[PDB]
């Protein structure tokens, strides 16, 4: 993959033109490269979404809702 990409980006220095077979080989190698490095972020819940009553929550454990970000409170800088 690296070699074919380098050939594609460097062939213009000697004033030639790549052939479609070489282009297809480069594309296939790049696809093989990109296949191995997927992400699939798998998005989370929302944060205010209630969790079920069947999960048996408790008072001191909180988690009435899926965990989310929490505000910062400062009494010296009047942001409000």
């Amino acid at each position: 993959a690296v070699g074919y990409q380098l050939l594609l980006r460097m062939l213009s220095d000697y004033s030639l033109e790549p052939t479609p077979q070489v282009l297809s080989n480069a594309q296939r190698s790049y696809d093989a490269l990109m296949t191995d490095t997927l992400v699939v972020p798998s998005m989370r819940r929302r944060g205010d979404f209630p969790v079920g009553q069947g999960n048996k929550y408790d008072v001191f454990t909180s988690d009435r809702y899926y965990p989310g970000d929490l505000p910062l409170i400062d009494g010296d800088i009047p942001n409000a």
Binding site: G47, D48, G68, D69, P71, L72
Partner: peptide, 13 residues
């Protein structure tokens, strides 16, 4: 959420 470096909250009616 942060929502561009803030902490605006969800509405809860």
């Amino acid at each position: 959420t942060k929502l561009d470096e803030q902490f605006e909250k969800y509405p809860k009616f």
